[PDB]
């Protein structure tokens, strides 16, 4: 497919986010590249408005599943690449247990040779004393699966999963994710059978960076179908 062919090599990525959480406004710019052949993402995000008012790990899922490695035998299930280059809209509600929620709308598409993720995020009903606005999450990340179901009616897909965020006191904070993806173009896309993306994420810091930022190394592999 034309879409799939766009990902056979290393592709530059740009991520741009404008956020408002409980009235705390912030912006983030990210740059990196993706190599779908290996399901590999390398990305560095910088808060351009100063200090990020929420923990970096809470924004990982929001900050390009078109870079997932779909094994050859599963290639017909890759909705994300099939929608390229025109791209897709990705919307989520992320509900933090006993705390507030993020709602996100993003457009993921090519601008020239570069894969762009443009995001608007709104967070409401958070506790200033809570794990999120209080910055009580550990700077790490567990492996998680993303469960995908087709949405024939919208010519797209949906997904659900929960993220387990480790808390500094030894507990875990759950973040329930509802996700929907719909093509921007009106052309054909691949509608998958049920499957999941296995995702491992590693968070780090750039030793030469003084700004508030996050370095992300991530591997994403489609699975669940034999």
């Amino acid at each position, epitope marked *: 497919g034309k879409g799939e062919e766009l990902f056979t090599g290393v592709v530059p990525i740009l991520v741009e986010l404008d956020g408002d959480v409980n009235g705390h406004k912030f912006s983030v710019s990210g740059e990196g590249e993706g190599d779908a052949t290996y399901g590999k993402l390398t990305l560095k995000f910088i808060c351009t408005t100063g200090k990020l008012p929420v923990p970096w790990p809470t924004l990982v899922t929001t900050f390009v599943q078109c870079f997932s490695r779909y094994p050859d035998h599963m290639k017909r299930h890759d909705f994300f690449k099939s929608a390229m280059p025109e791209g897709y809209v990705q919307e989520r*509600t992320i*509900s933090f247990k006993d705390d507030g929620n993020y709602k996100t709308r993003a457009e993921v598409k090519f601008e020239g040779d570069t894969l762009v993720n443009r995001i608007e995020l709104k967070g409401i009903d958070f506790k200033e004393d809570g794990n999120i606005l209080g910055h009580k999450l550990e700077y790490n990340y567990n492996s*998680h*699966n993303v*469960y*995908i*179901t087709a949405d024939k009616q919208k010519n797209g897909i*949906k997904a*659900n*999963f*929960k993220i*387990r965020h480790n808390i500094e006191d030894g507990s875990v904070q*759950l973040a*329930d*994710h*509802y996700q929907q993806n719909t093509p921007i173009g009106d052309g054909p896309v691949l509608l998958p*059978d*049920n*499957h*999941y993306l*296995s995702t491992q994420s590693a968070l780090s810091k750039d030793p030469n960076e003084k700004r508030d930022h996050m370095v992300l190394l991530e591997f994403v592999t489609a*699975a*669940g*179908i034999t």
Partner: nanobody
Amino acid sequence: VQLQESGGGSVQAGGSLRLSCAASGDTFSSYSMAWFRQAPGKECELVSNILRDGTTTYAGSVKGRFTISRDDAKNTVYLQMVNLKSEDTARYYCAADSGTQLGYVGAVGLSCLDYVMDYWGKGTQVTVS
């Protein structure tokens, strides 16, 4: 909430079994309920859902043989299995969740817990001979 499965055990191929799962407490109807199963050395499978809105889904391999249902008075969910096959041998788990549930069925990973649910039963063995 505690979940307790019953109604499993040994059964002849071609036979039937009705699994039951009873929830404690007074908060059942708002939960989406699911049955998972895992055989030795295989990925866990979410075999059937019954969502809060009543919607049911089934893994392709059990469609037409398995029927999921719930009783919001007895706070129980059931899995009626007919024409059991050797392929159905596994430990079966009941689960309840109040988060996003869309009716996913199929493989979920090497641990049933990889598909995050609010509450889990300890499961019950079903062995088809």
